[PDB]
From a paper:
This study will present a structural analysis of StmPr1, S. maltophilia’s main virulence factor, an excreted serine protease. StmPr1 is a member of the subtilases family defined by Siezen & Leunissen et al.. It shows the main structural and functional elements of the family, such as a reactive triad consisting of Asp42, His105, and Ser28922.
To understand the interaction of StmPr1 with inhibitors, we investigated structures of StmPr1 in complex with the well-known protease inhibitor PMSF and the peptide aldehyde inhibitors Leupeptin and Chymostatin, as well as the peptide-like boron-based inhibitor Bortezomib. All inhibitors bind covalently to Ser289, forming a tetrahedral transition state supported by the main chain amid of Ser289 and the sidechain amino group of Asp207. Chymostatin shows a similar occupation pattern but extends further with its phenylalanine residue located in P4. While the lower IC50 highlights Chymostatins as a potential inhibitor for StmPr1, Bortezomib has the advantage of being an already approved medical drug, which is already in use as a proteasome inhibitor in cancer treatment.
Author numbering: 1 to 356
The structure:
Amino acid sequence: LAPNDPYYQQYQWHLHNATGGINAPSAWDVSQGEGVVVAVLDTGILPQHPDLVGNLLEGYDFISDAETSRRATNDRVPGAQDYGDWVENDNECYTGSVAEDSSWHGTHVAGTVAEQTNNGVGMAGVAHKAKVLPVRVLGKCGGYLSDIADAITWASGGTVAGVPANANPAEVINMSLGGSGSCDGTYQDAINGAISRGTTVVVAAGNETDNASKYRPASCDGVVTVGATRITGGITYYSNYGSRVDLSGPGGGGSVDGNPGGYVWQSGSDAATTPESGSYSYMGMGGTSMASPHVAAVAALVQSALIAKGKDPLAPAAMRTLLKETARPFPVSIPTATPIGTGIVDAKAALAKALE
Ligand SMILES: *C(=O)[C@H](Cc1ccccc1)NC(=O)[C@H](CC(C)C)NC(=O)[C@@H](NC(=O)N[C@@H](Cc1ccccc1)C(=O)O)[C@@H]1CCN=C(N)N1
Ligand SMILES: [Ca+2]
């Protein structure tokens, strides 16, 4: 499928480039992810972006701190509107932090997952007939472990005190987020709960040019940990590495690969602070955060294709194995001290093996 989205051909190398893309054109001849729900646990969403509307579920906002969520109370509430995660001043988030503009990070990630495609508008998405379940866990200066843990529980169909039952449990959770430290205790348990309910959990490896074993959820047991590659097919300058990394997706090399080749391109906004301060746009961003949803969406394509043929969904372990086994080997040597998994997720190869 060669979709008609106006910026697809020039900007979206991560979809269709021969050394650094995920083989999406060929994959889309087989599956577009119809029938699956992917939970995007992130900064929230711009729910009326014209290139996403139609693919979104209402979702929920798990941030329990008014100052972080920018909402009127410390309550968690239905809907996942991103209020904007801008930080006005240096050092507000930690000693040494730098002021910056709103990210609209969750809208970009949701775009990779399910941006409306072949619609004559903007860009394309990977599992573009799936639905995104946006679950807002990150706000000003980030978010809180216990909000992130409960979000995993709910998104995967478990029960959380104080939140109504999830009518749309997700086959796949994407967490383009993390912090330093040991998985485990609260985090590992929430994750184990999602796995026991059949949900595949896909996370970013992190961006510290460091061992993924030192960050969470990158180092948790039972997740698919995703490193980041360049348009070239080689490691990005920032990608974490190490034996916990299972495979990689396109994250964008940054300035060394220029514009657009250094960046992943999707739905977002140019707003500096609040949604109203700007307007719907398409943004280029780089990180393991952009690689992770390519893999999450391939998982969605696979579940969808299985259900369409009347076959059983893969359990989480089988899904991770399939994604690793079918990854395309890197077209550029990876240094043995910085391994980033078996290869770059290959949407078509994963489909072909799952349907054999
Ligand atoms: C996209 O490339 C990155 C992926 C990533 C993976 C691993 C480690 C860090 C980052 N995604 C992001 O940076 C998220 C979106 C944008 C930057 C706007 N933001 C965060 O990940 C966010 N993390 C955060 O708030 N962590 C706190 C809660 C927590 C505790 C334990 C485990 C997981 C999360 C924390 O206390 O660590 C952001 C970046 C990393 N650090 C902070 N504080 N904020
Ligand atoms: Ca589009």
